[PDB]
Design a protein around this ligand. Structure first.
Ligand SMILES: Nc1ncnc2c1ncn2[C@@H]1O[C@H](COP(=O)(O)OP(=O)(O)OP(=O)(O)O)[C@@H](O)[C@H]1O
Ligand SMILES: Nc1ncnc2c1ncn2[C@@H]1O[C@H](COP(=O)(O)OP(=O)(O)O)[C@@H](O)[C@H]1O
Ligand SMILES: Nc1ncnc2c1ncn2[C@@H]1O[C@H](COP(=O)(O)OP(=O)(O)O)[C@@H](O)[C@H]1O
Ligand SMILES: [Mg+2]
Lengths: 97, 1544, 281
């Protein structure tokens, strides 16, 4: 149960794509959905000031190249890279809209 | 030099003329010329055979002039025949795809057309055979491989056109014409089928059945193209109501009819036609939907122009020009080549991009180069585009043997025929060959460009290009395509001038979701979209989540194998439901059957039957969770193969193997066998991957036997070690001069299966590759293991793989294969857990209880022993626990379970033989059950100790003994400190110490430190017994240990107790190949053709041959981690034979065994042996004798030595102590870390004793100080001569003085340690010490005499020169005495060697090396030296410089010569006969009357050993010395290294 | 006579061609001579002891690799060929390569299309200097792509304008050119979804009817507010003069990249120049 609420650094994992697949599989099993009909949406918030629901997984260490994220909206910047404090990966059903 | 050539020319010309009886009708004048030539040949036959003497026939006049005239005539007629063949190939250019002999066969067999049927497959895309009447005089039509046929509108009459070329050309032309007319009729009918609101299914199926699978799809595409063009023309007014919706609705209703057709049962051809039409109409529907969405209202809009559009104009008279294919601005005319029934590719957004790019390349008159990763549709998309335009597409699998000439011939054929050439794996060519081929490609493309100009007219000169110094007509239909897998291993880089001749296209991400949706839809799967949307993300998630293994592949080759299996499973389930309805009821409604069918269950079954077998143990739960999530609720239960399980039960019973079901013992292995059976069912290319000793070989052998007994089809297996032979011998060679193709091993096997002379096509043929896989040899099998199922050779030949042949690889890892090989084969993963240790124990006990050891009281002894050993060979038993503990100790080699188990089993067989010998020696009182029980239990403990810790040092053996004592209940020795490893088992059944077998001996004074003398030591008596046990079973074995440990002494001491075994010394170096073993076989063995096959046995009857390999782990590993010679030996040990590459014949070994020796694989230059090779060879670790053992061995030698002078009798113990102490300090101080040659072993301790003995032998008496002086002199000569730095020499000298005064306190220091310790037999008769000044004067006088008779170069004498000449003179006075002088050039090494050789009466031989010097010259010089030294008894100082080494072959030959004293392969042929004659006269002169060749060669070897002295001089390079320590290992353990260095 | 090195027949043909040309005065080019370093010694020795015709020339095309003999390098004149150093130099090379008669043809819009193609090619190649950022991998955008694109422009302009002196900018087959350049000519090398996205962005931005307006911006905000303006000329000479009067102030913003893309590369190049000056003090 605690492994869901730990924020991982995708750069520090040997196989981050396996982590993404594992989180997708967790969300699908928990909600009795199908794996192929799940899409990913990203919400960048502050590490301390964040809430993880049953479908959201926190990820740290993601660096944004050539842009800044304020209020989950992107703007171009002259900085080489901008650090994203905490990236929340929420798995939701595909809408096809 | 003329008779052989003329004879050969006449022989093959006579064969050609006689075999082709109809060649005379069309080659009249040269037929008469050859008739006259044959009359002359008959006259020669009747003249020369009358007198069978060379002198009787060279004296006859008119023979040489007539021979030259015949040679000229033969050359002229051969040229005429070649020019005729070229001219006949100019007409009907399709003959460029058949061989010269095949073309001649076609020429000679024009009367009988039955023989012509086997050549139409390679001269046409889909014409398998022609259709003929009963008269075989008129050509009615042609047929495809699937049986589909087209009937000619006007049949071609052979009688009216007797010549082969004319009627073949007419057959091709009529093929094209009849296909055009059939297309016109089919288009007329499908046009009626178009523009209709509803379609009658019966009429549509009738039309589908009427026409060929090619033409129905072509007509559908046409009709749709004119429909969309007309609809867009209607909308061209602007704002018009769309009739494109009508076209879409027509497509949808026709697709509904086709989809309803595939549910119900259809003939296979009509099913394939329906599948092709479904794919095509799905593409058409998608295109029409895109056009509707984009609101296209113009026919000139690029959204319509970019598509492939067909425009049919039957009114035009020309056959090629009725139909025109257009894509963007590229226009093509349909080739109307009969393509048979091909498999169609879902046209996806990437086959549409590929079509566009490749057609743009074609319109630009330059080739196309689709590139990307593996399994992306590159070859198949090129082939599909070629079939779309009706072109003849030839696929070539390129490799490094596709040189300039082979590619030139291929280009000539493509140019003349007018075909497309798909050169797959093209970057597998050499970079220089790619650069050379770019010129031909550029010339062809320039010819195409000049053809394309409007100024050119077909009535003008034909368009030609210069290919291979000839003008070749270039057809405008030619295309060149190359598919490359960039960045892959084994691939080259294309030159930049070659890349501009091709239009590249990255094909990296195939649209897998569409291919699966369309593939399932065309197979009758209702809800195919859902299944595709589940199965493609499933494969993506399997790729992402599962662990990274070298044999894993989840690409389009896996989807395509899963989808095909899904279709097959659905068909099988429908048939099963029909049978069940027949059993219960009668109503068989196919609509209801298709409606209520578990399609997700079928897909899961296919996934489990294709993807599960390859998964490792920790990945199976992940894939099953992925299946349960992607396909929730759907579950599949594997169907039991009850009949196959029973048949496998019988096979395992007769093969002493363990069978199990599910969770029973052996259940996993049987499951793996069933998985292999299924993957065999679905794949024609196979891999059994898994660690060594996991059950793969037994799995496929048991499967083959069970399939033979279950299906009735005989199973034939051809096991090939691909890396034990060169790729030239594996696939074949093309002669660069005469262009003559010689079949390889695999090529010969496949061609033999295809020919089916002995019914090989009716048997189940499996070609097993039991060896390592690398992208060099396995990628030649890319076109074989693909969907082309074809082996293409550089000489243009193509061999289709028959449907009954399976290509199987049995490997232990795939870490060097690229993803191009992994993606094309169905994997089965055999973990070591599949074969449990209990199963191996059961197999051993069953074989012991069934197979007698002698060839029955022996079987009764075996059964009793097996009954006794049964309790210990159980799971969680003594053997299992001991093996588990043994894996925690450290061994000199990587421990494997089966090496230990094989050693233990052979040792137990030797125990049974010991009991049999005891019974034979006590006929009155045979061994009873109690004595047998005690002996067998104690011997089991002893064998476990020696098989599980034999290759480990003393501490690890003691640890294993202690653990066994802790865990076992067998009686054990009660000694408190002595380990169990120090005990043996007497036949009475009691532990007896090995020390009772170690007696303190007294060596004879003349046998002191002799090569054949072994002082008995505990380790010697133990290792001799172990080696006797392993050799008596003829088991291969390896002795491992430091150099000088005593491995060869132990082996030769153990072989002395075996009188029927003769050892042959083989010295491996880094350049060793199987050729050395083959030369040894040629010299010491002979091939005889037994009725069971060819058998290689030693020449001497009744004697076993032992091939002793001195350095078995030196041979170089290629860039893919394989030693070819080690693979050869592993093949000879596993399968008991090898393949003779002369005629591709399996040769079975008999009375031949192998023994290897090596330094530990952690030593520099030593490679760890393969786990598959180490499985069969037990390893015994022979370590250096310790100070106590050294004291014992050399104490006996010194005691034997000091008996020469009785006054020195009391000094043996302190002398031996001083020797041992100084040797130990020298070994500790100077290690191989500092310099490569700083290797100190008991060998120096032996040379020390021998040197002191030789310096003491002639003296009548000597004081103690003289003895210490000799001791110190030998210490200096043995420990200081090799030292590089002066600090090392100073340390050695100071510590020599220290040791001498420590162990000999009451001696005169000055009279024994006077620093210039010089000894020489030059001034006196004996080897007494010499003083420096008198020695200098003597050397000065001898140098004056040397100048008078030899080199007149004056020399300056300094003390180092005197030291060096004394050192050289010491070596020149020894048997097999070779020198290695290392120092700067110009230091006097060669001059001093020559001068000392002049004193010692040694002839100086130096090889005269120049620019044109090569291997044969060195071999001839070696033969001259060996003949002079051996046959003529001449003492020769063979001085050789490192600059003379122009090749590694020189060093290999010198390695063998320096070690053995004889080169086995040097004298062969007439040279061997001359050598043997000369050896006969030489032995006669010596006084020995020797008759047999074996004893003459032994005498020759002894003479070469005694007489030839090799002096090797080299510069003191740092890395060069390390390189030579491996290239020529004998240079450092057979030569005496002397570091001259620069002048101080 | 052009001969590709690598085969024995190639060496024989090279020897024959050189022997014939040193007397007749023909030209001879041997390609990929870096693949036969041993034969280059013999070729240099043959050339040194020779008095060829006045007009004889020997061309040796090779890749820059150390296997080339030093003596051959000293005996001949070295011409390094590499990507042009900037947008201006690249466009100058492009305009010099294409013949004048090809650009100046029946439709007066052909010159503008060729200029747009030259600008696109220069922008595409100049982004390669910034390997992770300008593209995702070092694609081989070379002269073959430019020639194929010129051929496509010629073919489709000729098809749309049947010899007419003027064609409306709307009537120009923009979709054909964009699709071909993104699918066959330049998009063939691209094996990445995002690189294809970038190529499509560039093609839709540059190849459109608005490119014939007088206010068209080749590159916006190249430095602060300044931006590159599309030339308003209609002849090849006007476009070439616009290229020659380009400022010598090229920044990554001309390529659409951020101006900080070159900072690390420029710093490393300056340090390397210092090291090279010091290495041969
Ligand atoms: N079902 C079985 N029951 C008992 N013993 C078996 C069974 N299958 C194989 N063995 C034995 O176990 C050992 C495994 O050797 P096997 O030939 O099966 O392995 P392999 O996979 O070919 O390994 P390698 O790669 O070294 O050739 C052999 O002694 C074999 O006879
Ligand atoms: N018990 C022994 N009796 C005689 N010589 C021994 C004994 N133990 C070691 N040696 C000496 O050890 C050396 C072993 O040489 P060799 O058999 O060539 O070893 P290896 O095969 O390990 O290179 C010889 O000098 C041999 O005399
Ligand atoms: N002690 C010496 N006095 C005079 N010349 C010497 C002496 N040692 C070597 N040389 C010279 O060495 C040359 C021969 O070289 P050589 O001895 O064959 O070379 P290397 O030592 O490399 O085998 C002659 O010119 C000879 O004069
Ligand atoms: Mg391919």
């Amino acid at each position: 149960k605690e492994l869901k609420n730990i924020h991982v650094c995708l750069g520090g994992l040997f196989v981050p794509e396996a982590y993404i697949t594992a989180t997708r599989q967790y969300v699908a099993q928990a909600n009795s959905w199908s794996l192929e009909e799940l899409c990913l949406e990203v919400n960048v918030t502050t590490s301390q000031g964040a809430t993880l629901d049953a479908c959201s997984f926190g990820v740290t260490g993601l660096k944004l190249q050539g842009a800044t994220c304020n209020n989950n909206k992107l703007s171009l910047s002259n900085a080489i890279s901008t650090a994203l404090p905490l990236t929340q990966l929420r798995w939701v059903k595909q809408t096809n809209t | 030099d003329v008779w052989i050539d003329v004879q050969r020319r006449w022989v093959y010309l006579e064969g050609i003329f006689t075999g082709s009886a109809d060649i005379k009708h069309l080659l009249p004048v040269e037929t008469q010329r050859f008739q006259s030539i044959s009359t002359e040949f008959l006259a020669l036959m009747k003249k020369v055979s009358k007198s069978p003497l060379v002198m009787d026939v060279l004296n006859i006049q008119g023979v040489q002039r007539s021979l030259e005239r015949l040679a000229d005539l033969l050359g002229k007629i051969q040229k005429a025949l070649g020019e005729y063949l070229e001219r006949e190939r100019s007409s009907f250019p399709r003959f460029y795809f058949v061989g010269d002999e095949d073309l001649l066969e076609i020429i000679g067999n024009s009367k009988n057309v039955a023989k012509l049927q086997k050549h139409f497959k390679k001269m046409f895309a889909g014409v398998s055979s022609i259709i003929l009447n009963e008269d075989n005089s008129v050509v009615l039509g042609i047929s495809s491989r699937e049986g589909e046929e087209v009937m000619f509108k006007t049949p071609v009459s052979i009688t009216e056109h007797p010549k082969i070329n004319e009627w073949l050309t007419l057959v091709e032309k009529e093929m094209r014409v009849t296909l055009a007319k059939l297309l016109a009729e089919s288009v007329t009918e499908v046009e009626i089928f178009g523009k209709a609101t509803s379609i009658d299914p019966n009429t549509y199926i009738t039309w589908i059945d009427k026409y060929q699978a090619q033409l129905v799809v072509l007509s559908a595409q046409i009709a749709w193209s004119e429909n969309v063009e007309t609809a867009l023309s209607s909308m061209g007014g602007g704002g018009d109501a769309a009739p494109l919706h009508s076209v879409l609705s027509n497509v949808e209703v026709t697709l509904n009819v086709l989809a309803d057709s595939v549910l119900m049962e259809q003939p296979p051809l009509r099913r394939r036609k329906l599948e092709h039409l479904i794919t095509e109409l799905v593409h058409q529907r998608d295109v029409t939907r895109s056009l509707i969405k984009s609101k296209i209202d113009n026919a000139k809009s690029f959204e319509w122009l970019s598509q492939m559009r067909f425009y049919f104009d039957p009114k035009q008279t020309d056959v090629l020009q009725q139909l025109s294919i257009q894509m963007a601005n590229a226009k093509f005319n349909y080739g109307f080549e009969y393509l048979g029934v091909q498999d169609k590719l879902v046209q996806t957004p990437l086959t549409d991009r590929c079509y566009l790019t490749m057609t743009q390349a074609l319109e630009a008159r330059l080739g196309g180069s689709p590139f990307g990763p593996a399994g992306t549709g590159k070859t198949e998309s090129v082939k599909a585009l070629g079939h779309q335009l009706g072109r003849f597409v030839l696929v070539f699998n390129c490799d490094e043997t596709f040189d300039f000439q082979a590619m030139g011939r291929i280009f000539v054929g493509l140019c003349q025929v007018g075909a497309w050439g798909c050169f797959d794996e093209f970057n597998r060519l050499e970079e220089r060959m790619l650069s050379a081929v770019s010129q031909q490609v550029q010339c062809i493309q320039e010819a195409l460009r000049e053809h394309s100009n409007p100024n050119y007219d077909k009535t003008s000169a034909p368009i030609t290009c210069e290919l291979l110094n000839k003008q070749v007509k270039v057809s405008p239909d030619m295309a060149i395509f190359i598919t490359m897998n960039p960045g892959y291993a084994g691939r080259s880089n294309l030159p930049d001038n070659l890349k501009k001749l091709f239009r590249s296209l990255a094909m990296t991400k195939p649209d897998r979701q569409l291919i699966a949706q369309v593939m399932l839809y065309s197979q009758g799967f209702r809800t195919a979209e859902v299944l595709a949307n589940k199965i493609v993300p499933f494969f993506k998630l399997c790729d992402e989540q599962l662990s990274s293994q070298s044999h894993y592949d989840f690409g389009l080759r896996a989807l395509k194998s899963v989808l095909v299996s899904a279709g097959n499973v659905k068909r099988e389930r429908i048939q099963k439901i029909k049978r069940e309805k027949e059993e219960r009821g009668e109503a068989v409604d196919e609509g209801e059957i298709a409606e209520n069918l578990p399609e997700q269950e079928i897909l899961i079954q296919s996934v489990c039957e294709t993807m599960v077998p390859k998964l490792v143990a920790e990945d199976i739960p992940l894939l099953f969770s992925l299946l349960s999530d992607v396909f929730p609720g759907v579950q599949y239960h594997r169907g039991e193969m009850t009949a196959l399980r029973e048949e496998l039960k019988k096979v395992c019973q007769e093969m002493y193997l363990t069978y199990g079901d599910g969770e029973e013992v052996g259940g996993m292995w049987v499951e793996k066998v069933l998985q292999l059976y299924q993957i065999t069912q679905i794949n024609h290319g196979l891999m059994m991957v898994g660690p060594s000793g996991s059950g793969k070989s037994m799995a496929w052998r048991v499967l083959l036997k069970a399939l033979e007994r279950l299906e009735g089809v005989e199973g034939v297996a051809h096991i090939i070690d691909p890396k034990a032979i060169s790729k030239d011998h594996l696939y074949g060679t093309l002669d660069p001069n005469t262009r003559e193709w010689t079949d390889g091993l695999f090529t010969h096997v496949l061609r033999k299966i295809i020919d089916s002379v002995r019914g090989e096509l009716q048997k189940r043929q499996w070609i097993v590759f039991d060896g390592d896989v690398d992208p060099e040899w396995v990628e030649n099998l890319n076109s074989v293991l693909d969907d082309n199922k074809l082996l293409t050779l550089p000489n243009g030949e193509r061999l289709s793989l028959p449907p009954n042949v399976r290509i199987m690889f049995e490997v232990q890892d795939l870490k060097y294969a690229t993803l191009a090989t992994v993606s094309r084969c169905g994997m089965v993963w055999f973990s070591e857990d599949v074969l449990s240790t209990d199963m191996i124990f059961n197999n051993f006990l069953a074989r012991l209880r069934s197979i007698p050891l002698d060839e029955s009281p022996m079987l009764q002894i075996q059964r009793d022993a097996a009954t006794i050993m049964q309790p210990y060979f159980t799971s969680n038993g003594l053997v299992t626990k001991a093996l588990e503990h043994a894996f925690q100790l450290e061994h000199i080699m990587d421990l494997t379970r089966l090496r230990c188990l094989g050693s233990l089993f052979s040792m137990l067989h030797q125990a049974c033989r010991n009991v049999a010998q005891y019974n034979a020696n006590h006929p009155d009182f045979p061994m009873q059950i109690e004595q047998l029980e005690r002996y067998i239990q104690r011997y089991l403990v002893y064998a476990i100790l020696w098989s599980l810790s034999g290759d480990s040092r003393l501490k690890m053996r003691a640890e294993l003994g202690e653990y066994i004592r802790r865990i076992t209940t067998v009686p054990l020795p009660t000694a408190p400190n002595i380990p169990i490893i120090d005990y043996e088992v007497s036949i009475s059944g009691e532990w007896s110490p090995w020390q009772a077998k170690v007696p303190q001996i007294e060596v004879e004074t003349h046998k002191v430190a002799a090569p054949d003398v072994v002082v008995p030591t505990l380790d010697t008596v133990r290792h001799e017994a172990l080696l006797y046990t392993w050799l008596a079973e003829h088991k291969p074995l390896v002795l491992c240990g430091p150099p000088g440990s005593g491995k060869t002494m132990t082996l030769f001491s153990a072989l002395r107790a075996l009188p029927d075994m003769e050892v042959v010394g083989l010295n491996f170096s880094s350049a060793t190949t199987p050729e050395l073993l083959l030369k040894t076989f040629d010299h010491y063995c002979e091939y005889r053709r037994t009725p069971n096959g060819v058998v290689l046995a030693p020449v001497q009857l009744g004697k076993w041959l032992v091939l002793f390999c001195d350095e078995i782990n030196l041979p170089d590993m290629d860039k893919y981690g394989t030693q070819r010679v080690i693979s050869f030996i592993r093949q000879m040990v596993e399968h008991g034979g090898f393949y003779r590459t002369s005629d591709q014949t399996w040769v079975k070994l008999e009375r031949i065994q192998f023994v290897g020796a090596c330094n530990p694989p952690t030593d520099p230059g030593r490679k760890p042996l393969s786990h598959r090779f180490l499985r069969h060879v037990p390893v015994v670790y022979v370590d250096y004798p310790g100070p106590a053992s050294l004291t014992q061995i050399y104490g006996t030698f010194n005691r034997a030595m000091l008996r020469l002078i009785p006054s020195l009798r009391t000094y043996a113990e302190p002398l031996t102590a001083a020797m041992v102490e100084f040797y130990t300090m020298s070994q500790e101080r100077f290690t191989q870390d500092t310099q490569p040659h700083y290797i100190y072993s008991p060998r120096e301790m032996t040379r020390w004793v021998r040197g002191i003995f030789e310096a003491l032998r002639p003296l009548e008496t000597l004081p103690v100080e003289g003895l210490i002086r000799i001791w110190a002199h030998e210490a200096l000569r043995l420990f200081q001569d090799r030292l590089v730095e002066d600090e090392e020499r100073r340390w050695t000298d100071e510590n020599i003085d220290t040791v001498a005064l420590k162990h000999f306190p009451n001696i005169d220091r000055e009279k024994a340690m006077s620093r210039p310790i010089l000894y020489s037999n030059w001034l006196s008769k004996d080897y007494i010490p010499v003083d420096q000044e008198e020695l200098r004067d003597y050397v000065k006088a001898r140098l004056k005499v040397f100048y008078e008779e030899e080199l007149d170069v004056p020399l300056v004498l300094f003390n180092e020169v005197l030291d060096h000449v004394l050192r050289i003179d010491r070596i020149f006075r020894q048997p097999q005495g070779h020198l290695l002088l290392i120092g700067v050039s110009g230091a006097g090494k060669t001059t001093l060697s020559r001068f000392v050789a002049w004193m010692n009466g040694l002839s100086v031989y130096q090889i005269k090396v120049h620019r044109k010097y090569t291997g044969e010259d060195f071999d001839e010089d070696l033969r001259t030296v060996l003949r002079r030294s051996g046959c003529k008894n001449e003492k020769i100082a063979f001085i050789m410089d490192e600059s003379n080494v122009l090749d590694s072959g020189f060093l290999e030959r010198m390695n063998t010569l320096l070690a053995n004293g004889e080169v086995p392969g040097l004298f062969e042929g007439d040279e061997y006969a001359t050598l043997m004659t000369q050896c006969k006269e030489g032995a006669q002169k010596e006084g020995l009357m020797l008759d047999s060749h074996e004893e003459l060669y032994k005498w020759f070897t002894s003479q070469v050993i005694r007489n030839l002295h090799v002096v090797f001089t080299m510069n003191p390079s740092s890395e060069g010395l390390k390189d030579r320590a491996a290239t020529s290992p004998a240079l450092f353990n057979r030569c005496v290294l002397n570091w001259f260095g620069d002048w101080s | 006579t052009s001969i590709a090195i690598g085969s024995a027949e190639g060496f024989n043909q090279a020897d024959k061609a050189i022997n014939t040309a040193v007397k007749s005065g023909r030209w001879v080019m041997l390609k990929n001579v870096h693949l036969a370093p041993g034969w280059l010694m013999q070729l240099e020795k043959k050339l040194h002891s020779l008095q060829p015709h006045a007009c004889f020339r020997l061309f040796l095309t090779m890749e820059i690799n150390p296997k080339v003999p030093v003596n051959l390098l000293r005996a001949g004149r070295i011409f390094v060929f590499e990507p042009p150093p900037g947008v201006k130099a690249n466009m100058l090379r492009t305009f010099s390569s294409i013949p004048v008669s090809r650009i100046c043809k029946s439709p007066n819009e052909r010159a503008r299309l060729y200029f747009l193609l030259a600008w696109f090619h220069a922008i595409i190649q100049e982004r390669l200097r910034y390997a992770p950022l300008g593209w995702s991998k070092k694609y081989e955008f070379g002269e073959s792509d430019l020639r194929s694109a010129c051929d496509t422009v010629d073919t489709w302009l000729d098809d749309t304008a049947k010899g007419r002196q003027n064609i409306s900018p709307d009537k120009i087959p923009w979709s054909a050119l964009k699709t071909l350049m993104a699918q066959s000519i330049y998009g063939g090398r691209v094996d990445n979804e995002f690189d294809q996205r970038l190529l499509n962005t560039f093609l839709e931005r540059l190849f459109t009817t608005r490119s014939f307006d007088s206010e068209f911006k080749l590159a916006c905000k190249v430095d602060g507010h300044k931006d590159i303006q599309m030339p308003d000329g209609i002849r090849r000479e006007e476009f070439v003069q616009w290229v020659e009067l380009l400022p010598d102030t090229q920044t990554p913003s001309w390529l659409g990249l951020p101006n900080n893309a070159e900072r690390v590369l420029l710093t490393t190049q300056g340090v390397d120049m210092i090291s090279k000056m010091l290495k041969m003090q």
